[PDB]
Design a protein around this ligand. Structure first.
Ligand SMILES: Cn1c(NCc2ccccc2F)c(C#N)c2c(N)ncnc21
Length: 256
């Protein structure tokens, strides 16, 4: 197989391309290889250098098929650690949310929006450290210290922020904060609050009308629910920013 590496087993079968575990036969060094505006993805990946972000190793073409060498995460995905209808222990949820925020802070710091944060894209290494993966929807929202608004609609409807359904153009960062809130709900409740944040979705209307006696909100302790109250605000300008999330009571609660 490709140069020094053997493509042993498949780990992803998506609409982009597939992801294989590449064990080098020499050193035994094991990595992840993805097989295939992919020029766009590559140079975003070369930018990435943070412990809560999938490290890029390098690219290789073979006529028709491109090969992306990235840090392996042998722990699978966060999705796999969420029990349906239950979620996970609140302390594990807090640790993952800490690592997730660190990751999103980094990306935003280098002027990058991921645009498709959800548990399927949050992989774990062997010591259960979270890594933000899949920069195939990722784009630059800040360059030479000037922000550009987004207008491409993308991501996954249950994770997606309301402004993306309604506004012609919108700020990148509140969109990623929003989806982080949906991920936090899923970790604490083991279900997603709504199919879409649209005025035509009952469960979303129920949330705007603060009916937290309904699921999934009633499975969630008052401390994190208060943070979810600040994160899932429909007006992107009133929605909490990451610096202010970092000051939240539950974010700063000791748990084991
Ligand atoms: C299982 N697995 C991946 N799945 C691909 C994938 C799944 C979902 C969304 C996007 C996407 F690309 C990886 C990747 N990237 C991956 C990895 N880097 N290290 C270990 N295991 C991995």
């Amino acid at each position: 197989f490709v140069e020094d590496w053997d493509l042993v087993q498949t780990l992803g079968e998506g609409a982009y391309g597939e992801v294989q575990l590449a064990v080098n036969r020499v050193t035994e060094e094991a990595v992840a290889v993805k097989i295939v505006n992919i020029k766009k993805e590559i140079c975003i990946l070369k930018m990435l250098n943070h412990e809560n972000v999938i490290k890029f190793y390098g690219h290789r073409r073979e006529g028709n098929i491109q090969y992306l060498f990235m840090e392996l995460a042998s722990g699978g995905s966060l999705f796999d650690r969420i029990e349906p209808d239950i979620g996970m222990p609140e302390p594990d949820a807090q640790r993952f949310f800490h690592q997730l925020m660190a990751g999103v802070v980094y990306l935003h710091g280098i002027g990058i929006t991921h645009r498709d944060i959800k548990p399927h894209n949050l992989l774990l290494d062997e010591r259960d450290n979270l890594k933000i993966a899949d920069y195939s929807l990722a784009t630059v929202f800040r360059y030479n210290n000037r922000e550009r608004l987004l207008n491409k609609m993308c991501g996954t409807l249950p994770y997606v922020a309301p402004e993306l359904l309604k506004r012609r153009e919108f700020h990148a960062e509140p969109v990623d904060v929003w989806s982080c809130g949906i991920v936090l709900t899923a970790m604490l409740a083991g279900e997603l609050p709504w199919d879409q944040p649209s005025d035509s979705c009952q469960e979303y209307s129920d949330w705007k009308e603060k009916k937290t006696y309904l699921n999934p909100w009633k499975k969630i302790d008052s401390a994190p629910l208060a943070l979810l109250h600040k994160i899932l605000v429909e007006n992107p300008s009133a929605r909490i920013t990451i610096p202010d999330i970092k000051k939240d009571r539950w974010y700063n609660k000791p748990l084991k």
